[PDB]
Scaffold this motif. Sequence first.
Motif, short mmCIF file in Angstrom:
data_model
loop_
_atom_site.label_atom_id
_atom_site.label_comp_id
_atom_site.label_asym_id
_atom_site.label_seq_id
_atom_site.Cartn_x
_atom_site.Cartn_y
_atom_site.Cartn_z
N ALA A 77 -44.79 -19.30 -81.30
CA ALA A 77 -45.05 -19.02 -80.06
C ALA A 77 -46.31 -18.43 -79.77
N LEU A 78 -46.71 -17.49 -80.24
CA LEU A 78 -47.94 -16.61 -79.77
C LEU A 78 -49.06 -17.75 -79.95
N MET A 79 -49.42 -18.29 -81.30
CA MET A 79 -50.29 -19.24 -81.30
C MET A 79 -50.24 -20.44 -80.45
N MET A 81 -49.21 -20.47 -77.14
CA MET A 81 -49.93 -19.56 -76.14
C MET A 81 -51.36 -19.34 -76.11
N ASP A 82 -51.79 -18.84 -77.20
CA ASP A 82 -53.16 -18.87 -77.52
C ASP A 82 -53.93 -19.94 -77.49
N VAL A 83 -53.44 -21.18 -77.97
CA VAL A 83 -54.33 -22.41 -77.81
C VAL A 83 -54.04 -23.04 -76.37
N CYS A 86 -56.68 -20.66 -74.03
CA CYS A 86 -57.92 -20.85 -74.27
C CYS A 86 -58.38 -22.51 -73.55
N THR A 87 -57.52 -23.27 -74.07
CA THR A 87 -57.87 -24.68 -73.48
C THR A 87 -57.65 -24.75 -71.73
N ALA A 88 -56.78 -24.10 -71.27
CA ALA A 88 -56.59 -24.25 -69.84
C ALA A 88 -57.89 -23.65 -69.35
N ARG A 148 -51.78 -17.53 -88.55
CA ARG A 148 -52.86 -18.39 -88.45
C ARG A 148 -52.46 -19.78 -88.47
N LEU A 149 -53.16 -20.66 -87.46
CA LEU A 149 -52.99 -21.91 -87.72
C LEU A 149 -53.45 -22.73 -89.20
N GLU A 150 -52.47 -22.95 -89.84
CA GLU A 150 -52.79 -23.54 -91.16
C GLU A 150 -52.99 -25.02 -91.22
N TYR A 157 -58.22 -31.65 -84.25
CA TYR A 157 -57.57 -32.19 -83.15
C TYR A 157 -58.05 -31.32 -82.02
N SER A 158 -57.67 -30.23 -81.79
CA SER A 158 -57.49 -29.29 -80.86
C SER A 158 -58.92 -28.77 -80.52
N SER A 159 -59.75 -28.42 -81.52
CA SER A 159 -61.29 -28.08 -81.56
C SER A 159 -62.09 -29.00 -80.66
N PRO A 320 -69.10 -19.87 -81.14
CA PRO A 320 -68.98 -19.23 -82.68
C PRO A 320 -67.68 -19.57 -83.15
N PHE A 321 -66.53 -19.26 -82.06
CA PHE A 321 -65.27 -19.56 -82.66
C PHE A 321 -65.01 -20.73 -82.97
N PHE A 322 -65.01 -21.85 -82.32
CA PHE A 322 -65.13 -23.22 -82.68
C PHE A 322 -65.80 -23.54 -83.78
N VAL A 323 -66.95 -23.21 -84.04
CA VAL A 323 -67.55 -23.78 -84.91
C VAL A 323 -67.06 -23.25 -86.46
N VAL A 344 -65.66 -13.48 -84.41
CA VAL A 344 -65.54 -14.38 -83.43
C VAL A 344 -64.53 -14.86 -82.51
N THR A 345 -63.35 -14.08 -83.08
CA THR A 345 -62.28 -14.06 -82.17
C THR A 345 -62.26 -13.11 -81.07
N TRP A 346 -62.86 -11.86 -81.39
CA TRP A 346 -62.86 -10.78 -80.43
C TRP A 346 -63.74 -11.31 -79.73
N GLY A 348 -64.63 -14.47 -78.41
CA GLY A 348 -63.89 -15.41 -77.52
C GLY A 348 -62.83 -14.48 -76.59
N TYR A 349 -62.21 -13.55 -77.04
CA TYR A 349 -61.23 -12.88 -75.94
C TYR A 349 -62.20 -11.97 -74.89
N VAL A 350 -63.07 -11.51 -75.29
CA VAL A 350 -64.17 -10.66 -74.56
C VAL A 350 -64.47 -11.42 -73.29
C1 LIG Z 1 -57.96 -24.18 -78.37
N1 LIG Z 1 -58.20 -24.34 -79.58
C2 LIG Z 1 -57.74 -23.39 -80.52
C3 LIG Z 1 -57.56 -22.06 -79.91
C4 LIG Z 1 -57.31 -20.95 -80.96
O1 LIG Z 1 -57.25 -19.75 -80.41
C5 LIG Z 1 -57.59 -19.31 -79.01
C6 LIG Z 1 -57.23 -21.33 -82.27
C7 LIG Z 1 -56.66 -20.26 -83.29
O2 LIG Z 1 -56.89 -20.62 -84.46
N2 LIG Z 1 -56.31 -19.08 -82.76
C8 LIG Z 1 -55.84 -18.12 -83.97
C9 LIG Z 1 -54.26 -18.06 -84.21
C10 LIG Z 1 -53.69 -16.37 -83.59
N3 LIG Z 1 -55.04 -16.02 -82.69
C11 LIG Z 1 -55.35 -14.69 -82.95
C12 LIG Z 1 -53.72 -13.96 -82.73
C13 LIG Z 1 -53.18 -13.95 -81.55
C14 LIG Z 1 -51.96 -13.65 -81.14
C15 LIG Z 1 -51.44 -12.62 -82.31
C16 LIG Z 1 -51.90 -12.68 -83.60
C17 LIG Z 1 -53.21 -13.17 -83.73
C18 LIG Z 1 -56.06 -16.55 -83.58
C19 LIG Z 1 -57.38 -16.46 -82.58
C20 LIG Z 1 -57.27 -22.44 -82.88
C21 LIG Z 1 -57.44 -23.79 -81.94
CL1 LIG Z 1 -57.88 -25.22 -82.48
#
Ligand SMILES: CNc1cc(OC)c(C(=O)N[C@@H]2CCN(Cc3ccccc3)[C@@H]2C)cc1Cl
Length: 373
Positions: A77-79, A81-83, A86-88, A148-150, A157-159, A320-323, A344-346, A348-350
């Motif tokens: 569920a979280l992942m 939403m995460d995807v 970011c995509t939106a 993680r998205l394994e 695809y999403s990248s 950096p995140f997507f690379v 690179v995750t931090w 992205g969120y910043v």
């Molecule tokens: C729009 N494309 C993607 C976006 C992603 O995260 C924003 C990711 C991704 O791998 N996100 C991971 C999966 C979870 N997220 C951090 C997180 C969020 C909520 C709870 C725990 C960990 C990470 C940044 C992958 C793709 Cl392809």
Amino acid sequence: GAAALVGGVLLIGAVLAGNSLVCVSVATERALQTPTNSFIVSLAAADLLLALLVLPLFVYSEVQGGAWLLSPRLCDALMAMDVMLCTASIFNLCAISVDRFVAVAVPLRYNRQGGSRRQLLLIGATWLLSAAVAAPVLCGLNDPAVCRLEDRDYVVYSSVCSFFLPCPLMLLLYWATFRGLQRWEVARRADLEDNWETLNDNLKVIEKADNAAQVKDALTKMRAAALDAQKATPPKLEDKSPPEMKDFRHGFDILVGQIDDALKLANEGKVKEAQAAAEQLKTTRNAYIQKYLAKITGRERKAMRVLPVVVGAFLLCWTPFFVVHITQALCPACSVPPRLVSAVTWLGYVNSALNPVIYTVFNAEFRNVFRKA
Ligand SMILES: CNc1cc(OC)c(C(=O)N[C@@H]2CCN(Cc3ccccc3)[C@@H]2C)cc1Cl
Ligand SMILES: CCCCCCCC/C=C/CCCCCCCC(=O)O
Ligand SMILES: CCCCCCCC/C=C/CCCCCCCC(=O)O
Ligand SMILES: CCCCCCCC/C=C/CCCCCCCC(=O)O
Ligand SMILES: CCCCCCCC/C=C\CCCCCCCC(=O)O
């Protein structure tokens, strides 16, 4: 752990406060209610949803050293939403470029007042598209003590779909749009700004005039400014002959005609009537004139200055995140230090905290709405 907690709480606070202040400002202020700003509200929503639905469990995860102690279905569920969020965000930056290109390339004039709400429809499409990209994540793509998205095929695809493909397209559209507007800007900018000022100033002279002579004098100056402005041909139509040229001048012809009717009233001493006629001039200017004045004086291009900064910050924060992520997905042996994956995750969120600051610094209307603290 303490640093993740402190930084995390500050991050969530900054995102929530900054983006809510943007949403409410577009709500409270008529000067911020523009087509461009519909998308800005949409982006703000994406960041608010991120701070509410994703960042808390992300921060919790980081405090637990990256460990995920909750259910795999919640992780899915979280992942998703995460995807999606970011995509939106990216798809909305894309949508702005599509919208502004069409606005610049396809001049339209409506019979009815108000907008077409085509921005709302586009924004809706943007969110549905983002959901479409993210939807497989909800069905469970992983083979478990980590979130993680394994699925390597999905990540590539999403990248591509969410980032590496829209980014060049959006950069090309922003470029065409800015170049498109430049073509509308007259060489003698200051002269046309003077004409515009003469019009708007004397409208105010007319509203507060003491007598018919003052109204008549002001109207006379407006007439002169309207005729001068009518001769300011943008380079776009300079290679045109006396069709296109008919559209441009026709607005000014309606204006002068109304000014002439008002002059007759003022001359006869009918101050009230002349003033009401001057108010109807305001509406004509809005209809056939004002939008094009702002284009051909270079104001519309100037007002778009904030958009490259927003796009630039987004590229800085997410490249950096997507690379990193597409590299991992394409090449498991290409070992990225977990510490960098986290960094690179931090970063992205910043980004979700930066846009309110960017508007306040780089856009005049937001800045002025702010400056009245
Ligand atoms: C729009 N494309 C993607 C976006 C992603 O995260 C924003 C990711 C991704 O791998 N996100 C991971 C999966 C979870 N997220 C951090 C997180 C969020 C909520 C709870 C725990 C960990 C990470 C940044 C992958 C793709 Cl392809
Ligand atoms: C990777 C970070 C830097 C990249 C930022 C990308 C900028 C996106 C906008 C591109 C359109 C060109 C904008 C340049 C300023 C306006 C040009 C003009 O006024 O004609
Ligand atoms: C045009 C490409 C922009 C690249 C991304 C920019 C990142 C935005 C970060 C904010 C930095 C703010 C500091 C700028 C101060 C100068 C503002 C000004 O001179 O008007
Ligand atoms: C009313 C505007 C909508 C956004 C509200 C502000 C959101 C958070 C921004 C404030 C941080 C201010 C950082 C300093 C830049 C502002 C200085 C300036 O106005 O030139
Ligand atoms: C739009 C922003 C700029 C984009 C930067 C360029 C993107 C490059 C991303 C892909 C590099 C990852 C490939 C590394 C492993 C490839 C496997 C192989 O070579 O066989």
